[PDB]
Amino acid sequence: MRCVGVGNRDFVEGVWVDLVLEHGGCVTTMAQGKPTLDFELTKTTAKEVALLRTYCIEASISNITTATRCPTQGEPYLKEEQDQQYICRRDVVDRGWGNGCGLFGKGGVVTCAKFSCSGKITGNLVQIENLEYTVVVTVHNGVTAMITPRSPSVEVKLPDYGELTLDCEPRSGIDFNEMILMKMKKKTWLVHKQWFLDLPLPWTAGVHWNYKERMVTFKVPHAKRQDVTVLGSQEGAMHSALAGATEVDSGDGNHMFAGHLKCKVRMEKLRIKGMSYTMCSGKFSIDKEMAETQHGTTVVKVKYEGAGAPCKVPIEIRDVNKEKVVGRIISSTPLAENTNSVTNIELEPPFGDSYIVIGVGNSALTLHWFRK
Amino acid sequence: MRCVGVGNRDFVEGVSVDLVLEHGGCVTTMAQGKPTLDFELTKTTAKEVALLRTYCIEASISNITTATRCPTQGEPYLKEEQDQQYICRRDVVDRGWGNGCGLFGKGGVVTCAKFSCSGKITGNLVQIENLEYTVVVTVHNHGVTAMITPRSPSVEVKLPDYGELTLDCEPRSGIDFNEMILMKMKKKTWLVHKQWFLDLPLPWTAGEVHWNYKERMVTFKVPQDVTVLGSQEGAMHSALAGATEVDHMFAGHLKCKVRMEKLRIKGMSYTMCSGKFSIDKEMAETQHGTTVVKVKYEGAGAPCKVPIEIRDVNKEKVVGRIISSTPLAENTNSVTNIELEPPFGDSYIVIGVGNSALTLHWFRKG
Amino acid sequence: SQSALTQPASVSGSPGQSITISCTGTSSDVGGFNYVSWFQQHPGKAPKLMLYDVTSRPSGVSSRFSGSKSGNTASLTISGLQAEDEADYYCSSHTSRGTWVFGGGTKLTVL
Amino acid sequence: QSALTQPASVSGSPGQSITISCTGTSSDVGGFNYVSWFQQHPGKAPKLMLYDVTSRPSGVSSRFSGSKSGNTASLTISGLQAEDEADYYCSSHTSRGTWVFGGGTKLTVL
Amino acid sequence: EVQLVESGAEVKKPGASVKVSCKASGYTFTSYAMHWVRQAPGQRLEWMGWINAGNGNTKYSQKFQDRVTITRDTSASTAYMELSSLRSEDTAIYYCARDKVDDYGDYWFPTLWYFDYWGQGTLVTV
Amino acid sequence: EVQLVESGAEVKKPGASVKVSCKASGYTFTSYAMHWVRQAPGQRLEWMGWINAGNGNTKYSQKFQDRVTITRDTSASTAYMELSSLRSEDTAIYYCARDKVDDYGDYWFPTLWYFDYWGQGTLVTVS
Ligand SMILES: O=S(=O)(O)C[C@H](O)CNC1CCCCC1
Ligand SMILES: O=S(=O)(O)C[C@H](O)CNC1CCCCC1
Ligand SMILES: *[C@@H]1O[C@H](CO)[C@@H](O)[C@H](O)[C@H]1NC(C)=O
Ligand SMILES: *[C@@H]1O[C@H](CO)[C@@H](O)[C@H](O)[C@H]1NC(C)=O
């Protein structure tokens, strides 16, 4: 009873069952002589991630050094020009008596500034082999199961209901050979490998920043001299470029993805707990009023106030004239465990007027139901 | 002696004068029986500017509040929805027996967050009537500041011992300021198109700050939580690639008419220097095909006229021209700046009289 | 500090008789959701979950304890009073705002 | 240590002439004309005596003269007076855009 | 079997801070949220806030958001509750109660049977 | 006329910070740059740095870049100089000197007649 109330819900009926498990959604299975089960893919977690490239999205300039020279004297030199951590640019300015030079004409200048990153983004490789799928299987009245590419088939034991084999194929997630896991401050995305490698920002693999000029302000030749300044923050520019991209959830270690795990369930060793009991003779009462779900089905809680329990709960969906059985019961053979025991039942009444009968004889509870 | 080192320099000669003053430009005026003057446009400052809009380029989210409700029960409410400092959005989620709802279906939700701006950009309206032009007029051998306003274009400039001049100017500009905005971002300033600036998809205000369209910086997307869009500083710098960067230092050439009627040459009232001269500053060629030299008058009988002549290779006839109008030596050990225009090739610059006269060889490549 | 959930301060009852404790809230808690729970607190001991989901009760809790809800008012009914029932009773609710509110408390006295 | 070298003490007789040297490098004194001379009386703030190597402010006497040859700048005081007895510093704007001062020279008048 | 072991009673002076704890035993600590409820002598129970032990997320009551700080130690299966700038009014018994978190690890909606197991409470006198 | 009024003498303990000032009078503060030069008792003058009062840009000496912070108040025509983590060696007289900025606002090259007007200096004593 975990699938009821979930918006994305698929019903699967087979007569060996084929089912597709996705994030945010869950599958309800039905089969003759087999129990009604709920299946859900809880999480797709990636254990380890290998660092590939680190881009700089925010930078600052420090240790500003300038060297000036008079005309005819040659070009000025700074030791910082040979330093890979600094950005150096040359300009040529009007010199003369007013600027402290004995000679008039164009005098050469050089400015250097230490480049420091304050905001970075990482590109990590996600290995499909290390993926772990958490599947929760619940019976109508949950047991957790793990699917790994190394151990895809798993045996799931259910108390009093038997055992099932869950053979799944971890083929989900777009080819991680062409996909990159991009991290930015607190958010994570799954982007294309080529798109990530083509980003026009300074980058490193190991601090030495390759292509720092991608973060440095553009210089126009026919304009007044300016200081060696850097571009603001590419944080917002990045968020604009990630509009189409799929956002990945990241917590306290590991990354959670949106899987699409294809499974084959073996319902051979499964048995219906309830078939071994006789019909309830006593009176029933409504514990929780019957309510319609988002799947055209109804749910009701019944309290068995009679004796002779454990016993089968008698339920039938009759027509407007209360004669023939017209509806269908989703819950596989519901039982009343003991006296004053509460039972949840999923029903599928037809469109329009119908009568849900719970119990036997005069003591039987008759509930009118309309379906729009 | 202001224009001497300036690269963009123009020489203007008349009788008693049409001149165009531009930023980075320098105008040297010459006239017979009138002093040699330097004119320069210092700044184009608008004394009263009007703020049009302030955009948010960097924001942060705080004090997140959520309120849920069951299906059919209506819409949930929060006190923060009435608060202008808060950004609220509505949606629906799956509700049922497990979520504490008696009914199944989509149940209305509302989420609010405290929006705070940490980085803003301003756009000010530039008006041509409020513009103030600062013109500095210097005499050969500090300068006198003058103000030009469209309301008061003509101005009287008094120069001690040199007389007085009338500076009648008219502001002329190509670009339309009615369609232009002065955009400021942290330390840099730009001149952008009015429509382009008003079309910017960012939160904004006019003039404890209320922000219009906070959702242009705030997303409600989750992989329930409020997400910020991050600094738009770099995105702005990318969009300003074509735009013209500004330093109150607007571009536009001021056309002027100067009245040199009341002007007089300080020096004409003195006699020629008899004593010896020495070079204070060696003679140097400028970027305008002219030369400049500082001379120290070591002799007596000052104030007196400095005797300078540009003679030929054979030291016989006067071949060159002197730019600086009748230079004088104020007192003993006084230094004088002189701008000369020697001809192409060999010439001799003679400073002084008789044997004590200083003879300087000069070769003008050209 | 005043609670959003209102309960009578003291409720008395005779042994082997039925008694009811009321818990009035608003449309934002009791009247809005089924997150209505009842707790028993003996002197010196920590609270014990007696009822949850308005009517549901944990395995070890007696059938003598029953729950009800009508509008913004929730009710706890104890049938066939015993001397051990003499304890403080609190009602709780999960609010529209995603918080938990408790009632003022009801001291049950058994005669 | 200062980049500009000046003699610590220079003595002179009244009415006589005296010269104070200031040796720098091709990066300051030998490179630019931003060579200035300052007079500092005991307890008082420095006073600009010479700028642009040779130029002097309006209130400064003609007795004070400046010179430059290579990386060495010179200050000449003609006809010494008792009031001239003060500390003299030379300064220069450098290639790096900084300012350097000399060690100073205490002028003693006999 | 499920059990919550609370820290010992503490006597503090007004204007100081106090840190109380609750150790989880018999269940997966990360799969549950730890709530903090206080009770002054002779007064009602008052909810303070919670901590999702799985991701470290919190939610406090408006009366306690400025003074209360709830933390957790996954390695020791212990949940901490710090109350700064305590006054004479803070003289109360501090109870911890458990509630299961959703299988994904998010604590949006609680389980209908919230506070099924409680700590014996720490008496903090001022 | 032109005058620079310096702040009063201060006695500080080692490991603390000190903030000195200079108020401009008789000239347009925005058009000039404020320099800071220090002098220990019996020692030479040592240049610390400058502030362009027009745009707020600075330049410090390599010996003072980590400890010295120069600020300005355009409204009050006052220039401030803060020296953090004081030591016994910082016991000096702190002089302020003016120099005109270029007409365009940028202080690339100083004026030929730099430090034409000085402040009387603040004696900062470190015990
Ligand atoms: O002290 S006051 O009279 O202001 C308030 C009084 O403490 C409230 N007591 C309730 C009574 C029911 C059991 C739980 C505690
Ligand atoms: O104290 S030490 O002897 O180490 C160094 C001594 O202070 C240097 N004094 C100069 C002398 C010329 C006037 C300016 C100060
Ligand atoms: C908002 O959150 C901060 C902590 O981030 C807190 O200090 C502040 O008091 C909160 N404000 C309100 C109105 O609750
Ligand atoms: C750079 O400047 C910082 C102060 O901002 C200083 O601590 C550091 O030593 C400087 N580095 C170099 C190489 O000068």
Author numbering:
A (entry chain A): 1 to 15, 20 to 145, 159 to 223, 229 to 394
B (entry chain B): 1 to 16, 21 to 145, 158 to 223, 228 to 243, 248 to 271, 277 to 395
C (entry chain M): 0 to 9, 11 to 27, 27A, 27B, 27C, 28 to 95, 95A, 96 to 106, ...
D (entry chain L): 1 to 9, 11 to 27, 27A, 27B, 27C, 28 to 95, 95A, 96 to 106, ...
E (entry chain I), F (entry chain H): 1 to 52, 52A, 53 to 82, 82A, 82B, 82C, 83 to 100, 100A, ...
Question: What did the original publication write about this model?
Answer:
We determined the corresponding X-ray structures to 2.1-, 2.8-, 3.2-, and 2.7-Å resolution, respectively by molecular replacement. The DENV3 and DENV4 crystals instead contained one sE dimer with two scFv C10 bound in the AU, with considerable differences at the two antibody-antigen interfaces within the dimer. In contrast, only one of the two half-dimers of the asymmetric complexes was compatible with the conformation of E on virions. The epitope periphery of the second binding site showed clashes in each case with the underlying M protein or the E stem. For the purpose of our descriptions below, we termed the two half-dimer snapshots per asymmetric dimer sites 1 and 2 to mean the compatible and non-compatible epitope with the interactions on the virion, respectively. In the case of DENV2, DENV3, and DENV4, C10 binding selects for a presumably less populated asymmetric conformation, in line with the affinity studies.
